[PDB]
Design a protein around this nucleic acid. Sequence first.
DNA 1: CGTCGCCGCCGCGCGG
DNA 2: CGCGCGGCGGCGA
Length: 902
Amino acid sequence: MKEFYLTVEQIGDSIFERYIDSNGRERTREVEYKPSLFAHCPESQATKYFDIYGKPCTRKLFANMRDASQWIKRMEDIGLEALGMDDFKLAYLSDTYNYEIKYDHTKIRVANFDIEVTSPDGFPEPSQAKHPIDAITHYDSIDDRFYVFDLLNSPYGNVEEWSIEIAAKLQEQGGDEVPSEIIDKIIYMPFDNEKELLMEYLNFWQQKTPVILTGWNVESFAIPYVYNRIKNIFGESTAKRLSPHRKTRVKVIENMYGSREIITLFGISVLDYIDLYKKFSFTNQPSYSLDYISEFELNVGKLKYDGPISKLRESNHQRYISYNIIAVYRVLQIDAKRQFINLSLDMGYYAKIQIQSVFSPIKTWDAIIFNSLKEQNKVIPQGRSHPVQPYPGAFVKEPIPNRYKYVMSFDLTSLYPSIIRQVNISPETIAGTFKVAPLHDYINAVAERPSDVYSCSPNGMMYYKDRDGVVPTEITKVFNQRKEHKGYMLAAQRNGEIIKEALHNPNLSVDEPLDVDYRFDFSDEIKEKIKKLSAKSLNEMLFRAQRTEVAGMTAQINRKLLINSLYGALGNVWFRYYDLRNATAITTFGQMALQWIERKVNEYLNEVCGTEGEAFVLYGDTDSIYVSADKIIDKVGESKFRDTNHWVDFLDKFARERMEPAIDRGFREMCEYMNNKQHLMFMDREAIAGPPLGSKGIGGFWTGKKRYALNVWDMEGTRYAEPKLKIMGLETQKSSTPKAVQKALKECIRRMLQEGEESLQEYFKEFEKEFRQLNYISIASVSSANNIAKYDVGGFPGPKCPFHIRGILTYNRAIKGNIDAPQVVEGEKVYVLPLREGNPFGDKCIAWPSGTEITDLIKDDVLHWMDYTVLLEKTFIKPLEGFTSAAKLDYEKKASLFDMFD
DNA sequence: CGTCGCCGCCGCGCGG
DNA sequence: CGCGCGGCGGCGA
Ligand SMILES: Cc1cn([C@H]2C[C@H](O)[C@@H](COP(=O)(O)OP(=O)(O)OP(=O)(O)O)O2)c(=O)[nH]c1=O
Ligand SMILES: [Ca+2]
Ligand SMILES: [Ca+2]
Ligand SMILES: [Ca+2]
Ligand SMILES: [Ca+2]
Ligand SMILES: [Ca+2]
């Protein structure tokens, strides 16, 4: 097989590499890598190396990596550019793997672990590590085994061995309900003392050294706790055994306020699942406890135990160990669903970077572009220093707040990357500038043609047309990968709807789910078999369709994020190819493209319907337009439609056969106007929205920019079995809005759009009546706990103190002098509740760490002093009034002349 | 060391 | 609660 790397590190003048050899064996080597860097040379001397601008370069081969670094410093002191890849391990990887990497994941050792630490005096700080580690569960992907290390004897209690028999039993039998599919995969090792547990763990680590190391909070907690505990007991050298090259670094993480120290383990790639989840999941959660994320992702019940975790080992060691094993497995289950490890490996090997560098798109694109340029013997420019400067972004149209009955949306495919490709925007393709007219002049086609030679953007930039730049070239490859996965995702989604439709008539029989590839549209023979299946088999198929859809979602959305991040990188000072002329050329072209096509769509539809000056486009943001279709529906008449699906088909056909061709003509004209290299403005229909036929639903509404709701029947070719709410910006979508409030507001909007004013008033009245019975967590707001110390004046709110920080300060005063109470962590999430006047907490609100029940010390007093009236008015009534005034509805029945009879 | 636009809640200081 | 400005948090693209 083709060799591939596992990990790479620079240590002094050595590269340390772990890799899989041609036989599929893991090896390690130390190479005294001789790096090359480059300097511009005279035009007359013969060379095969050229910088991106076509300037001749001479190669400088160095005796070692330290020489290369010192040369860079001398070139600065002289005042001359030192070209080439200064991250020597990326250059090593490029030299060693001078081909497209085919990797085999089954050869890569992925480790998932978590630890337990009993602590009677508060949170066990990793940097101190003064408490014994009493449990480690470490899953190995190559062995497919959970290795459990269990401490029987501790200064905090002597315990009996964990029983695998009781662990396997149901909770109703007094067992722990450890899933039966992992019971046979557990290798349990009890220890008489902590020293022997840790020594054995290190020996185990040595035999089965992680390549990818993951888990939940392993970077912030598990890794540093284990490193420091071993350091405190045995000394630094023993702790350094967690690195296969015995080198570690104790380094700070800096964003802004405060600092925390993480441990870098050389020769290991740490991918903390929390960080993977935060970057790749496209959620913002109220809580990041594993309980919370597990319940959200997998629909599994929280891990249930009595008393504080500080007493769980002592009171119920059996459950303590089982819950440690389950915690590890739950991260595995999330990953089997989300597939973030697979994504990381894919992106990592594609760019030829350390796998952990997937968190950094700048690093990712730096390596992609370097490998692409190196292939042609081209030399990358030196990184320069730039001051941060603001620059303009997208156009957002001010909507008229209103209800909107029939709506069709259109959207440009992968806009910013397509602008890059269409215009040919790259560092080496800059051709010059033209004199700029006001943007509205380009939008209205009255400004003079920018160039008869080069490809232009309305910001004044001009680009070569003879050849593709490296940025368009490399962004195209990833875009094409994105497109494949999106296709798989949408087909899985369409297949899902076929199963949903069939579930309305489930046949009664014992059968099995069909063995099908959900990434491809179901054939006719498959569709017919589904129609004859039982609810049980259909449900399993729906689950599988939905898992296939999620996998597709991960692959496509994160490839989209990567290509969009290349646009973003052009506007970040740390990017090698930072250039505000290029970033602005993209965003300005975008503003033109949107407003240009608004004009065209309006002009076209006014021609179709026979009017003048009527605005059909009601809204647009960046790359999408929202078109009012009332008049199109009205031109045939609502009475001519059999049912909802009929007018939906009509609009679908109208958009595809009439509007899209016109849209294309308008964009082809724009391409010619700007003299662009290639026409790539592809605007397809996205949503078809409206009320159910014969109902009093309003269909949709806008309250303002970025704030709207639509009742959607068809989304990019997916015809839904049941109409689906597209809600953007509104309180239903914010992680800060209480869960019960999100749910209620969503049902209010559902009723408005699908059923009408009367239905909405019924629901509101009922919600107002029953509100006070809602569980306190379901009605707590959520916020992020930033800058606590800034507004802390002696435990009391300082000037300008934010509402949620006031609540934290209240909490801190309430729990002061108690080691056992959960501390609020700087930068983490908190639940927030209003407090009635005259409460014993001495303030108007209280906040506590999210994902948790509030400590039993203050729970009783919070529930008694919770201000339901303020809660209802602020998080529910105010937003609903906002919705209803925008939609011209009343959420309370106004009096009428009829209130006079019967 | 991906980006900008723009919403609503809040504290503050008005607003005769 | 009437208003706008700046801080903040959090989305929508
Ligand atoms: C979501 C997102 C968009 N944008 C910018 C770039 C996008 O091209 C533009 C429009 O966003 P979107 O319409 O959300 O996405 P898209 O057009 O790039 O991809 P799709 O084919 O799925 O429609 O907004 C970012 O810069 N960063 C982001 O994270
Ligand atoms: Ca735990
Ligand atoms: Ca788009
Ligand atoms: Ca689309
Ligand atoms: Ca059937
Ligand atoms: Ca869009």
